[PDB]
Nucleic acid binder design. Structure first.
Lengths: 99, 198, 60
RNA sequence: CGUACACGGUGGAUGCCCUGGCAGUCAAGGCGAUGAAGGACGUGCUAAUCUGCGAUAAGCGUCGGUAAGGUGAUAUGAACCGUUUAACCGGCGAUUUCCGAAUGGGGAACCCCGAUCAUUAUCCAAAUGAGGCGAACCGGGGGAACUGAAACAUCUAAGUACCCCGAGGAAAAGAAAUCAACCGAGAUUCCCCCAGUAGCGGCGAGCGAACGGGGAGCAGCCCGAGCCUAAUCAGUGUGUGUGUUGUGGAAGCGUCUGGAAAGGCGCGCGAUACAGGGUGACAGCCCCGUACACAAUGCACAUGCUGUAGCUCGAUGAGUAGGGCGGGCCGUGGUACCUGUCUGAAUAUGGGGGGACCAUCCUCCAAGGCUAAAUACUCUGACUGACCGAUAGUGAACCAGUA
């Protein structure tokens, strides 16, 4: 699964290449990565999309389908950050197949 | 005539057997649709031992209705009760008979002795542990498309076939028209054919 | 203050603490006075503290 | 101004979708004088509702789980909490205002006390009980009419509707003064059948068994004396299995179309794992999840063990059996059962019964008592449905039992 404690790597959007830590996960399935933001009217580094509007939903809204946490496969992505106190999860993390 | 059985190697021929009963393609199409329908719910009515306490149930006014366990039934007034109208035993099912249902069971057994149908397999079939072995015996048999049809056997449920497509294993003893023809079609084993004779 | 601190305190120390905290919560009543210095944090903690000490006093 | 059409509108149908209903199935099943259910009023920095709590007020503590984020539904502004590891999910303890069975007394939530009945009684309420609630199931009493009979007084609807009292999770019955195809069966219910037969009936309409048989489930036992004791009683230790709920975790190619493929075509893979969901369009191999295994809770019933304790002899229960008068009720017929008034036996060298009465066979013995097991709903949890689809379906998929 995806955790806000895991660092992600964009791969499709215009933010392709940027690295950062998740800021929160919504029930809708959208994730906000620390670093992926927009420039408001009064120049305020706040995450959001793009089009004229009023009160609004923050977050750049990224799809899990185009993100890149761990992903064992022939890809261009590299390292990714990840609990430990579990122990059993450490074994899986140690296995090049599980995590 | 003589129904040519098949070996694990799906050999051209083995022993022989058959069933005698005027097969009716008029006896292999709905029945199990009725099974498919009737087998799924059907509010009978009176079929229940529910009874009435009469007055004095519990300190409160409780009409002496056809009660049971803690809820009323049978009475058309309360749900699950009998329908107050005319001509239909259960829910949306096909009214009907014990004979045709069986007649279809007999007739179906005869459907097996038809050219464009199944084929009898030797007893050794029940031995095959793995499923893959079956797929092969079904390939060389030239009836792999029968996976869309169904399957059967004798002695015990075939664990190696249960996996296969739309496979609902059954034994020669207890076989219902549905089994004999998971859609007016099927396949059996040598011993199975003998057991089914009864 | 944490439960650990209250237990270590003496019977008298818990009494002077409760009385002192009661003193706090009261000056905190400045909420109605619309004071600025006020802070919702300690306001909500004082009621718990006086409660904790009260419960531990019973535990004794 | 008539008609058709066009553009726009009105209106809301239709098509598609549905976080809802309807129906069935499996599991599980009581709550309260250590004062509950319900209701009222409060409680969040701002909060009017709902929900959660309740003045330690949408919370406090402990252990375990879980996990790095979180501050209920509301994704606001400010601010704050978390690694002295919170949020969130599960046992046990503490606190637990007032009224309410409340019970001092009065009272539309407000003011001052074990009220009332009753048992024991150191007669002091001192020690206890009852007084309420709960969806409908079992038992014990009271008991209609519309209606049918194509009128109606029996009969019928009813022993139903409704009234009263009380138990449990289940209730009633029960070891035969029975049955009565016999050198026979042989505790009692219930299911099937026997029967729509025997029987009843302006014999009109209608009403309507049982013995037996085939099954389910099986268990038999207690009251005067003599003697003596492994049944019972008190206490101790204390589960298995099963059922319910919760928990652990990786991985995505080529061509074409497209904003994006979970498309089409080509190639390949897993499967004690041919459920479902998510992800920019129909993804078993992209993510969750499913086998697998683990954990918590309930089950806790039982078993084991300590001290208790057999057995023997005789009899066997009268206002009853029975009779008469007057009624109720029943399929009950001179041959059902029960109530009320009156009368009234004998005793196993006796008596009752085998569907009429009285004298002669067979069976069994009342007028005392107890007794396990065989099912039945749906509040609650989960699952399913050739069911309906928002003038459909529960009245309620939207504040609904609200306005």
């Amino acid at each position: 699964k995806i955790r806000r404690d895991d660092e992600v790597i964009v791969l499709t959007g215009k933010d392709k290449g940027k690295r950062g830590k998740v800021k929160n996960v919504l029930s809708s399935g959208k994730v906000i990565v620390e670093g992926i933001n927009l420039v408001k009217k009064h120049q305020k580094p706040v995450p959001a999309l793009n089009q004229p509007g009023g009160i609004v939903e923050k977050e750049a809204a990224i799809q899990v389908s185009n993100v890149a946490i761990f992903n064992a496969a022939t890809g261009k992505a590299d390292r990714v950050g990840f609990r430990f106190e579990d122990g059993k999860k450490v074994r899986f993390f140690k296995s090049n197949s599980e995590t | 005539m003589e129904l040519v059985l098949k070996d694990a190697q799906s050999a051209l021929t083995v022993s022989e057997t058959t069933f005698g009963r005027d097969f009716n393609e008029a006896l292999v199409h709905q029945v199990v649709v009725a099974y498919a329908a009737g087998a799924r719910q059907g509010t009978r009515a009176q079929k229940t031992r529910a009874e009435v306490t009469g007055s004095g149930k519990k300190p409160w006014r409780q009409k002496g209705t056809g009660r049971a366990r803690s809820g009323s039934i049978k009475s058309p007034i309360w749900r699950s009760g009998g329908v107050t109208f005319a001509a239909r035993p259960q829910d949306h099912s096909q009214k009907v008979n014990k004979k045709m249902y069986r007649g279809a069971l007999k007739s179906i057994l005869s459907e097996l002795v038809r050219q464009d149908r199944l084929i009898v397999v030797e007893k050794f079939s029940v031995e095959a542990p793995k499923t893959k072995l079956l797929a092969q015996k079904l390939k060389d048999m030239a009836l792999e498309d029968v996976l869309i049809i169904t399957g059967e056997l004798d002695e015990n449920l075939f664990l190696a076939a249960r996996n296969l497509h739309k496979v609902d294993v059954r034994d020669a003893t207890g076989i219902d028209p549905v089994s004999l023809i998971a859609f007016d079609k099927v396949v059996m084993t040598a011993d199975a054919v003998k057991q089914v004779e009864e | 203050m944490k439960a650990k601190e209250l237990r270590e305190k003496s019977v008298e120390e818990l009494n002077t603490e409760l009385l002192n905290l009661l003193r706090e919560q009261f000056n905190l009543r400045m909420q109605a006075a619309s004071g600025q210095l006020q802070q919702s944090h300690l306001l909500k903690q004082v009621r718990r503290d006086v409660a904790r000490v009260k419960t531990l006093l019973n535990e004794k």
